[PDB]
Write a protein that binds this ligand. Structure first.
Ligand SMILES: *[C@@H]1O[C@H](CO)[C@@H](O[C@@H]2O[C@H](CO)[C@@H](O[C@@H]3O[C@H](CO[C@H]4O[C@H](CO)[C@@H](O)[C@H](O[C@H]5O[C@H](CO)[C@@H](O)[C@H](O)[C@@H]5O)[C@@H]4O)[C@@H](O)[C@H](O[C@H]4O[C@H](CO)[C@@H](O)[C@H](O)[C@@H]4O)[C@@H]3O)[C@H](O)[C@H]2NC(C)=O)[C@H](O)[C@H]1NC(C)=O
Ligand SMILES: *[C@@H]1O[C@H](CO)[C@@H](O[C@@H]2O[C@H](CO)[C@@H](O[C@@H]3O[C@H](CO)[C@@H](O)[C@H](O)[C@@H]3O)[C@H](O)[C@H]2NC(C)=O)[C@H](O)[C@H]1NC(C)=O
Ligand code: A1AFA
Ligand code: NAG
Ligand code: NAG
Ligand code: NAG
Ligand code: NAG
Ligand code: NAG
Ligand code: CA
Ligand code: CA
Ligand code: CA
Ligand code: CA
Ligand code: CA
Ligand code: CA
Lengths: 370, 584
């Protein structure tokens, strides 16, 4: 049998974060010897959902011109974002590289000023959390204006270390239980797990926060994160990543986006001018698609998805777990069928179904007729 | 399947020294004793002013498992001029790669940086020390006049090393030419001959080296890993090397001819940032004398039991066709984030069935991430994808994950028992373990029951106790057995009559069972007489009579002088059954 247990209707002044965008939220399925039991999930895109955006920027020397064009981004993005949100917060972080040989020069001179002596570059660093999430865009402009460009030796940069920190450092970044945006801005490729071995870093990234005075202090000790490690911690801490990378590295980051769920790629201009419109285009792209995930499923039991998206386009297979072209406030529906076989222990299996990027989840509780 | 995981030799080093980061065997040509070569690249030495120069330890397989460091170099930093150091040995990671062939011992320090001769720099050209028999020379082919990242300044030469069978070193330098990477090969005789302690950039006449290419090839890390093997059929070992950051991090593997360093074949990874080429190995796995290519990608993501991507790692197995091509299949790891494929060690023929074997590690797998090593056997059809043995790491995480399996070396019979053994390093706890290969016994059992249809009135044999004649039949069982092995192998065979109220008994014992301590030399049969009980003693003449034999392990008395007990071949059936029937 199939018996729904919880089903608060979807939402439609002032509203906190207790909005319901998915229904039902808890049901129990009794499963016979291979009998499909099907139920329907309804999703409605909230009209006005708050936004957290953390701006993580490459501050190596090739980004010198960009750093100048971001001195006002906090107020500019905030004003543009008000045409989307009533509750927006902004943050800023910077990264360069692991601060060890061979990725940086280790002469006392170049350790002080890694650039060509003439420039006013500050020392290389792994990750700096300049400004935690705040609604005061005035503070963003002030603090970004005080940041100094840096430099290092090899072309691909160390952003993956900083990405891991931003996702797993939680309250030190300031994340609320809202839609979380991490903007990754760079003009080069990336290092990842395995690259550390050249500098004698042969211990995998441990996926913990290691900030001291808003500085990552463990880049000399933990390797770069892998793609898979970033996937885990980005998903687990519910962060949607926007890759703002220059044209020549569009091929690289577009493939990266295909491996990172709820990620987007936009083309960054020379001195990073279209960053606002790029971000807006990304949010609309991220916000117009919902992707359902289910937790770990028991062995011998199978799950299938069917989508009923807008314009009655019905997708099957892996296309059934996602819908696109979702306007603000629109409703879509998914029917999910579960079919059993044997019957494991306890008879009390409970997995979650969740839309990627959101905290709301549907608890599907299973009972097996033995 | 035959590795002794019961009495392994356990070696440990100075705490924090990363003892076990690299392993190999020491087999001197003065074929006296054999030793384990273990790198401890973060080990403090007695060099004046040198913090953590690192060292390579020689461990005694003898009896006392005490390791003694090999003094390759006791000096501190040379000066180019007054107060102007020429080189910088602190944290140079000496012992990060250790490689041995007969009396030759080649170890390197990939993080060795030097000043250059035209400016005051700190450029990691990397250096190696080559200890032949008596002499001990330095080898730094990347310490040149082509300096800076534009040239060989950040080459880190010696990041990977290996020997060819014609006394060439193959050296890998991942940093040369803006991290294009570079492969360098010099004759061992020329490295020792042209050595001069007052020359900082030595020219070698018979040198093979890859040249600088276009900028699109920057950031490739050619030389991250190396291995040797013939791949165009000329008897000369060719150069295979992982290029893990090439093709926009899809990773590649280059193969270069061992004569003129020309490109032979390329492999290309299928997934972004999987680190295709983190390790490479070359060994003939299907017994056709064409070396086969093993390419590890420990970050490769597959599909889990659900729909989410999961890091499990992947090894590609490429079988060398004589047609020049490769027939390639792919083998995935088993545990998430275990880094299956971080290290690939050809084992030789671990069980000696005529097909070589291989180990593939997942240094962060198993319970509590203590490290796992998988043993895969070869056969005519390629690699048997089901691992025949799982070696588990035994040491809990002290400060760091133990990284059991991060380095490993095989293909050497250190106990001269006829079977090659395996060294596994666990640098995260300053440990290295030697696993002994047990000899493999193949047993051929027989069981005959004739006549098979049993006439209750054909009472031929006399029951030796009473005088009553009985209905009797023969139960004949055979046994045959065949490394360096004990002549007399003691087998314990037990027989059981009837499936269930045992209706059939042995003549000389009136019991359903027998048991016998028989001895085989690497045929042997033994005949018996069993009888039916009287028709009045039992009902049910319809259920058949199953004759169940069961031979058992050679137990204590089969052990070697070292206490190393052999093993029955993994194919061995546990028992054999026969049947007899009664008439109507
Ligand atoms: C496995 O994968 C590897 C890596 O991808 C393959 O190896 C690559 O092969 C290609 C093609 O074989 C190589 O390109 C060749 O490079 C040589 C050497 O050029 C260098 O040296 C020259 C002499 O000193 C120098 O003049 C060159 O500079 C010129 O070129 C650049 C741009 O190319 C230009 O900007 C300059 O202004 C100069 O004009 C350069 O520094 C070069 O001689 C070759 O040119 C020949 O071939 C091309 C077409 O192939 C032809 O147009 C020319 O007329 C000439 O006949 C060619 O450009 C590349 O260097 C290799 N890379 C690596 C890392 O090894 C390998 O092939 C794969 N194996 C297999 C089996 O497929
Ligand atoms: C090899 O010998 C060197 C010294 O000859 C040892 O280095 C020393 O190790 C200690 C312990 O980690 C370091 O102390 C630390 O100092 C920092 C401040 O710099 C402090 O914040 C820490 O809490 C800790 O006290 C010390 O700096 C370091 N000295 C060096 C590197 O010169 C090294 O540990 C030895 N290694 C082995 C494997 O024995
Ligand atoms: O330009 C330099 N660094 C680049 C990285 C790069 C290097 C090489 C090629 C491309 C990009 C950056 O910081 O973005 C650079 C190089 C050498 C020296 Cl000494 C100082 C500097 Cl600041
Ligand atoms: C977010 O929600 C989770 C559970 O839904 C809760 O444990 C956590 O404390 C919340 N954190 C914030 C910052 O809202
Ligand atoms: C999708 O299914 C619905 C039934 O729920 C149907 O009304 C609609 O026409 C279908 N659309 C297509 C394209 O099949
Ligand atoms: C390398 O040697 C082989 C053997 O004769 C030859 O055929 C080939 O052309 C050579 N390649 C180069 C680049 O010299
Ligand atoms: C009776 O039993 C004996 C026992 O071996 C056998 O040799 C003989 O052939 C049997 N007689 C038959 C089958 O007629
Ligand atoms: C088998 O015989 C050997 C010597 O012949 C003896 O050492 C061993 O103890 C015997 N085992 C049994 C079970 O009789
Ligand atoms: Ca850069
Ligand atoms: Ca860099
Ligand atoms: Ca050859
Ligand atoms: Ca082969
Ligand atoms: Ca074998
Ligand atoms: Ca042995």
């Amino acid at each position: 049998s199939k018996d729904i247990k919880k089903n608060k209707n979807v939402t439609n002044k002032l509203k906190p974060e207790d909005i319901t965008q998915i229904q039902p939220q808890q049901l129990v399925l009794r499963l016979r010897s291979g009998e499909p039991q099907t139920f329907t999930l309804k999703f409605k895109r909230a009209e006005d959902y708050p936004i957290d955006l953390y701006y993580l920027m490459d501050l190596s020397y090739s980004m010198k011109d960009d750093l100048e064009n971001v001195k006002s981004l906090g107020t500019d993005l905030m004003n543009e974002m008000r045409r989307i949100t009533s509750d927006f917060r902004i943050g800023f972080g910077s990264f360069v590289e692991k601060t060890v040989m061979p990725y940086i020069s280790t002469t006392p001179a170049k350790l002080r000023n890694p650039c060509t002596s003439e420039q006013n570059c500050t020392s290389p660093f792994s990750y700096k959390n300049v400004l935690s999430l705040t609604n005061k865009g005035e503070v963003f402009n002030e603090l970004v204006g005080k940041q100094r460009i840096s430099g290092n030796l090899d072309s691909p940069e160390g952003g993956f270390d900083a990405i891991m920190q931003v996702a797993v450092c939680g309250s030190l970044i300031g994340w609320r239980n809202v839609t979380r945006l991490l903007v990754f801005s760079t003009d080069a490729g990336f290092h990842f797990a395995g690259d550390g071995k050249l500098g004698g870093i042969v211990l995998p990234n441990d996926g913990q926060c290691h900030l001291e005075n808003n500085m990552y202090t463990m880049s000399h000790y933990y390797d770069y994160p892998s793609i898979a490690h970033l996937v885990q911690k980005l998903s687990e801490n519910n962060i949607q990543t926007i890759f703002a990378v220059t044209e020549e590295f569009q091929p690289v980051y577009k493939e990266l986006k295909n491996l990172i769920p709820k990620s987007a790629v936009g083309t960054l201009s020379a001195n990073s001018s279209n960053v606002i419109q790029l971000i807006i285009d990304a949010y609309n792209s991220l916000s117009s698609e919902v992707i359902l995930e289910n937790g770990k499923l028991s062995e011998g039991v199978t799950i299938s998805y069917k989508s009923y998206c807008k314009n009655g386009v019905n997708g099957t297979g892996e296309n059934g777990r996602k819908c696109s072209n979702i306007s603000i406030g629109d409703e879509v529906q998914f029917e999910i069928s579960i079919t059993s076989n044997k019957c494991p222990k306890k008879d009390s299996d409970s997995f979650k179904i969740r839309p990627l990027g959101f905290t709301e989840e549907v608890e599907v509780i299973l009972q097996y007729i033995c | 399947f035959n590795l002794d995981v019961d009495s392994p030799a356990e070696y440990s080093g100075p705490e924090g020294s990363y003892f076990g980061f690299a392993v190999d065997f020491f087999v001197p040509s003065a074929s006296s004793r054999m030793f384990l070569l273990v790198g401890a690249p973060k080990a403090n030495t007695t060099q004046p002013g040198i913090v953590e120069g690192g060292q390579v330890l020689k461990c005694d397989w003898s009896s006392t498992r005490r390791c003694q460091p090999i003094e390759f170099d006791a000096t501190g930093n040379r000066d180019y001029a007054k107060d102007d150091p020429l080189e910088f040995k602190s944290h140079q990671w000496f012992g990060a790669s250790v490689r041995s062939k007969q009396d030759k011992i080649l170890a390197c320090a990939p993080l060795y940086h030097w000043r250059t001769e035209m400016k005051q720099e700190r450029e990691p050209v990397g250096t190696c020390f080559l200890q032949d028999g008596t002499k001990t020379v330095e080898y730094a082919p990347c310490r040149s006049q082509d300096i800076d990242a534009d040239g060989q300044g950040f080459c880190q030469g010696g990041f990977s090393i290996d020997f060819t069978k014609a006394d060439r070193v193959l050296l890998g330098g991942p940093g040369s030419f803006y991290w294009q990477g570079q492969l360098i090969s010099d004759q061992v005789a020329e490295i020792v001959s042209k050595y001069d302690p007052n020359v900082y950039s030595i020219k070698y006449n018979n040198q093979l080296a890859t040249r600088t290419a276009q900028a699109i090839f920057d950031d490739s890390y050619l030389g991250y890993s190396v291995a040797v093997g013939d791949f165009n059929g000329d008897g000369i070992d060719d150069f295979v090397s992982g290029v893990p950051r090439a093709a926009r991090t899809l990773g590649m593997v280059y193969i270069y001819d061992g004569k003129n360093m020309s490109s032979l074949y390329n492999f290309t990874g299928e997934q972004m940032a999987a680190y295709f080429g983190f390790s490479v190995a070359a060994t003939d796995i299907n017994g056709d004398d064409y070396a086969d290519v093993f390419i590890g990608a420990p970050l490769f993501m597959d599909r889990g039991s659900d729909g989410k991507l999961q890091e499990v790692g992947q090894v590609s197995v490429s079988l060398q066709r004589a047609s020049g091509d490769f027939q390639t299949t792919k083998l995935n790891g088993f545990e998430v984030f275990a880094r299956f494929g971080s290290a690939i060690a050809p084992l030789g023929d671990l069980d000696q069935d005529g097909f070589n074997d291989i180990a593939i590690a997942a240094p962060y797998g198993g319970e509590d991430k203590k490290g796992i090593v998988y043993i895969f056997n070869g056969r005519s059809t390629g690699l048997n994808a089901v691992p025949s043995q799982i070696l588990e790491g035994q040491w809990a995480a002290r400060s760091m994950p133990p990284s059991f399996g991060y380095s490993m070396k095989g293909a050497t019979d250190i106990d001269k028992n006829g079977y090659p053994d395996l060294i596994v390093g666990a640098f995260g706890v300053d440990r290295a373990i030697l696993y002994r290969a047990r000899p493999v016994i193949t047993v051929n059992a027989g069981l005959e029951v004739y006549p098979s249809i049993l006439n209750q009135d054909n009472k031929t044999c006399s029951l030796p106790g009473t005088a009553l004649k009985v209905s009797c039949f023969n139960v004949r069982f055979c046994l045959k057995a065949d490394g360096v092995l004990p002549r007399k192998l003691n087998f314990q065979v037990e027989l059981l009559l009837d499936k269930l109220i045992r209706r059939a008994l042995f003549l000389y014992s009136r019991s359903p069972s027998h048991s016998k301590n028989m001895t085989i030399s690497r045929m042997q049969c033994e005949e018996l007489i069993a009888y039916l009980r009287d028709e009045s003693e039992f009902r049910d003449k319809l259920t058949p009579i199953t004759i169940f034999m069961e031979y058992r392990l050679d137990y204590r008395t089969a052990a070697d002088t070292t206490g190393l007990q052999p093993i029955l071949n993994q194919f061995t059936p546990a028992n054999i059954s026969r049947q007899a029937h009664i008439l109507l």
